[PDB]
Amino acid sequence: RRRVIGQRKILPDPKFGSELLAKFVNILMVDGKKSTAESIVYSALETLAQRSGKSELEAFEVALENVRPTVEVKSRRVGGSTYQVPVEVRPVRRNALAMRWIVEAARKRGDKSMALRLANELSDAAENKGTAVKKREDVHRMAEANKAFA
Amino acid sequence: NQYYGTGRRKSSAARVFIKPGNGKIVINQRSLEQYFGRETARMVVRQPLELVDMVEKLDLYITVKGGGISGQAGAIRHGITRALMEYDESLRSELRKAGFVTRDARQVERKKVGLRKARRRPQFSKR
Amino acid sequence: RIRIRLKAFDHRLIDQATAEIVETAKRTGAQVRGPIPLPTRKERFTVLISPHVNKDARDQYEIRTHLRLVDIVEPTEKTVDALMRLDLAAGVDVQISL
Amino acid sequence: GQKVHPNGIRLGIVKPWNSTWFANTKEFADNLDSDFKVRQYLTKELAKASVSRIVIERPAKSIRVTIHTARPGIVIGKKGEDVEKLRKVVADIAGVPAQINIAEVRKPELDAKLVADSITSQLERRVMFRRAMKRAVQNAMRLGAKGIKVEVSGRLGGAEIARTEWYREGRVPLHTLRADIDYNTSEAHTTYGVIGVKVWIFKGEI
Amino acid sequence: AKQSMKAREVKRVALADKYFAKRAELKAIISDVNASDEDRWNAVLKLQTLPRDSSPSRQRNRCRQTGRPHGFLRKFGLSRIKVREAAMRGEIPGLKKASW
RNA sequence: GCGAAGAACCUUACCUGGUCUUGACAUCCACGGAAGUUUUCAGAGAUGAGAAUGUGCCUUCGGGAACCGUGAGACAGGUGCUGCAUGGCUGUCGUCAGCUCGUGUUGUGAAAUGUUGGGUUAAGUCCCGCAACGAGCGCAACCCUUAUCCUUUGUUGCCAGCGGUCCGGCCGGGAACUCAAAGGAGACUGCCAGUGAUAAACUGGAGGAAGGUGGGGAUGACGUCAAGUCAUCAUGGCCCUUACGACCAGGGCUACACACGUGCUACAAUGGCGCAUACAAAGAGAAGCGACCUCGCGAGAGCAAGCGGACCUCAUAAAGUGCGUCGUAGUCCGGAUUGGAGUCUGCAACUCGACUCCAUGAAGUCGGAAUCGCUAGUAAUCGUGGAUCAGAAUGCCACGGUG
RNA sequence: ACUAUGGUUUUUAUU
């Protein structure tokens, strides 16, 4: 329906003053145990502090700056046929897209603590050096190249 | 001269008192950093306080009882807003900007027939 | 030297029965206080709405149990005598104790 | 679908509950059983006595019962001793000393028990039910009330259907809770069908 | 449900008040605590539990109207098979339609 | 996980063998007995027979009524049959905006028009137009529930300045906040500009605790399968009656080379374990809730503080926080299974019950084709309580924390 | 794009 959100407001991180670090713990946490996620955020930043050339205060933002697309491909029905169309990636999602991919990667991993599973993906999330890892972005590379019918 | 405000949330209730001129920060006969707001919600009572701040311009005194400590915090936040929105006539514009003047009454949804654990139709994880 | 009790379920009968007891207690005692309260309780329960199967269809019932300590100013021998024969309709419950 | 009960919605508000007595959960079902044992006793001895209701009390270490009838003089007799043969029995069913009391019913032409009896006395003469129920309510509305309904249910002769036949005048009413609504079902037990007669009467809102 | 079920409590419930709710708290008259590995009480206590049907167990309230055991609810005073018809007649004090 | 919320003898119907039959149960009439209590002998018991105690209620002294039995003439009994004999009760679309009358017209009439058509709305609600005008049932509102302020109500509840002190809101002081309760007022498109066959009403802004039925509940129009059920009931009929009836007792309703129907706890380290540590809501309870200590390996037994259930018990809420510790190993773990000991309740736990201890010891590291569900205190997730109950739930109904 | 099929019989008119 129509008379719906939008985006509900969230309160920014009390220690860092950031709304990205507030959304990050909300999607990172599991079974609503946000208190454990508050021990994983910044604890996963241990090996990134000196390695960040934007300084520590952008050592996580850098992994979200790596990917900021304008369109994504979707496969949608027009009748008895189903075709690939480009849909807009708005400012509200443009900064939260890669954040959602990094937590999935860490949850799908199974070695060390969670604060080390998260650090494995975050170490390469602005380097992209691994094999078959940029297949992640084919859903936006196929969108900046959509032809469809007009 | 003293300013007063009240707030209630989830079986808890708070009373807040403020004096002009820099001084103490008291809650339940202890300091505001002495036992309260150490868990998962922490800074909820300080959300409106950041618009004036502690050890800066006022003397603060709180009394709170009932329920759990996060319900207490969401009650204190309204009670301190009610006091601060008469402490200065241009501070109130900023409390209605941050939306701390709005009174929350969300509580929980009530059950109906035929439903399960407070909510939801008799359930099947498959088919 | 005794103390009193009144217990009910009806929100008006509790006061109508109070107005019987504090008057029976005033007819032989001139000093007054008026009634004291406590404890009030509530209770709710559910039942199946039909006698045969139909177990997904249900109805909601509740009660509210009202109690007063009432208090008596002079519980004198002549005043408790009037309370040994206390009537007072059916629909409420009382005690006398020392 | 599901229907709200026109009587059950108003119990305790101007229309009283049929019994009054306090009991705790350890004996509530045991007091109520004595309360039903006396109903099925008294209403089967008083089967032809113009009785519309009975009202039960528990006075101090006792029981008390009021009988509401349109014809009290043959129920209390001449006077107060014709009831002992029932009093000695309800006092044993209740396990406490008993009192029997009398009440006179108002407007039998305007009461849901007695207007139904005024339709049963036409069905005893095997007439068509439709005119019979209409006449009994037309006699009632010309005397009082602010709205009346009558309905007949089941095996009516009649048709091969689940539908009733009915007649209504005036207000139901819906949401007035001071409406003191009077209601009854009486089964006619005819040669070829049990035939339920259902009546609803509304008289005022106070 | 059978007409035999209506009086099945009559002896059972009477001995529940008489013995079956205090005999263990008063057991010190049919017991000894001074003789080691010695019995002089078991056969007289087994003689006390020799009778049947009346037990601390086997005890059910039932629907005295029908004999039906299942669907009893003490908070309603009546078994649910008759609750709506009794509560819409106004027969059960103080049950009414008011919902949630 | 439905009706069968706790299927030991019970509940309870099935199978088997006993004990008996105008019936375990109803009612009319007569007749022998008070109602009752206790115990011996035979039987496991239903049943078969003695020895002893009591003689109530009642009165024309003629005898009698409850009540317990025995029996005749009438009749009963049945989880037997009959949802194609009948009531009473019952799905669901959907809480959709429609169902249905009188008069006029129109048609040969059934009927149609009306209520359709244009917009607005949650709406047959309103606006526009008008061969139709009005109306009942439904819609709305009522009822009901939540936020703000004032007024009202205060003990075994509460406490802001301040004396006295069962050192305690305990007494003086207060009636206000909380906590539990009631009654009002406030939100009305009110206000501006914009849009709208410029109209219904919408689109933003201010101001407010709240804005557009404020929000949330209660409510099932006509119609839907003439639904499921005589297994709660009655109630017409049929069949059995020397029984298909009911009183005991023993097996069964948790047979099984295999299928369906759903949950909970884990398979782990955003997790567990051991030791600390922060904070509850709602209920239970004197033949009770039970604080402690002692015996012991332990359940528990034995005694027992406080308390009459608003200054006690049930009761270190737990998860969370934090420290110590650990891995990709079917694990520190788990302890599912199998004997032996016991502990409790109870004719009785062998079989089908729970709790405990020394020992032993397996499964679980995403999981079939294929597919499931809602929009925020919602999903997700952890503890607390109650019901049933002689004696157990993980199911049933509720409570709060993290979110 | 493709995606077929479902026997016969089985309701309401009251005096």
Swiss-Prot record, chain A:
RNA-binding keyword on record: yes
Cellular component per GO, a single term: cytosolic small ribosomal subunit
Keywords: Ribonucleoprotein, Ribosomal protein, RNA-binding, rRNA-binding, tRNA-binding
One of the GO biological process terms: negative regulation of translation
Subunit structure and binding partners: Part of the 30S ribosomal subunit. Contacts proteins S9 and S11. Cross-links to IF3 and the P and E site tRNAs.
Note: The strain K12 sequence is shown. Has been predicted to contact the N-terminal domain of IF-3 based on footprint studies; exactly how IF-3 interacts with the 30S subunit is controversial.
Protein name (Swiss-Prot/TrEMBL): Small ribosomal subunit protein uS7
Organism: Escherichia coli (strain K12)
Organismal lineage: Bacteria, Pseudomonadati, Pseudomonadota, Gammaproteobacteria, Enterobacterales
Gene of this entry: rpsG
UniProtKB/Swiss-Prot annotation, chain B:
HAMAP family: Ribosomal_uS9_B (MF_00532_B)
Lineage start: Bacteria, Pseudomonadati, Pseudomonadota, Gammaproteobacteria, Enterobacterales
Species of provenance: Escherichia coli (strain K12)
Protein family: Belongs to the universal ribosomal protein uS9 family.
Subunit structure: Part of the 30S ribosomal subunit. Contacts 16S rRNA. Cross-links to the P site tRNA and weakly to the A site tRNA.
The protein's name in its UniProt record: Small ribosomal subunit protein uS9
Function: The C-terminal tail plays a role in the affinity of the 30S P site for different tRNAs. Mutations that decrease this affinity are suppressed in the 70S ribosome.
One GO cellular component term noted in the UniProt record for this chain: cytosolic small ribosomal subunit
SUPFAM superfamilies linked: Ribosomal protein S5 domain 2-like
Superkingdom of origin organism: Bacteria
Keywords: Ribonucleoprotein, Ribosomal protein, RNA-binding, tRNA-binding
Statement: the UniProt record of this protein carries the keyword tRNA-binding: yes
Keyword Ribosomal protein on entry: yes
A single GO molecular function term of this UniProt record: RNA binding
Pfam families named in the record: Ribosomal_S9
GO biological process: cytoplasmic translation
Swiss-Prot record, chain C:
One GO cellular component term noted in the UniProt record for this chain: transcription elongation factor complex
SMART domains in the record: Ribosomal_S10
InterPro entries hit by this protein: Ribosomal_uS10, Ribosomal_uS10_CS, Ribosomal_uS10_dom, Ribosomal_uS10_dom_sf
Origin: domain of life: Bacteria
Recorded family membership: Belongs to the universal ribosomal protein uS10 family.
Oligomer status and interactors: Part of the 30S ribosomal subunit. Can also form a heterodimer with the transcription antitermination protein NusB. Binding of S10 to NusB is mutually exclusive with its incorporation into the ribosome. The rRNA transcription and antitermination complex (rrnTAC) consists of RNAP, NusA, NusB, NusE (this protein), NusG, SubB, ribosomal protein S4, DNA and precursor rRNA; S4 is more flexible than other subunits.
Name of the protein: Small ribosomal subunit protein uS10
From Swiss-Prot, chain D:
Entry's Gene Ontology cellular component terms: cytoplasm; cytosol; cytosolic small ribosomal subunit
Signal peptide: none
Pfam families noted in UniProt: KH_2, Ribosomal_S3_C
Domain KH type-2: 38-106
Domain of life: Bacteria
GO molecular function: mRNA binding; rRNA binding; structural constituent of ribosome
UniProt key word rRNA-binding: yes
Full protein name: Small ribosomal subunit protein uS3
Organism: Escherichia coli (strain K12)
GN (gene name): rpsC
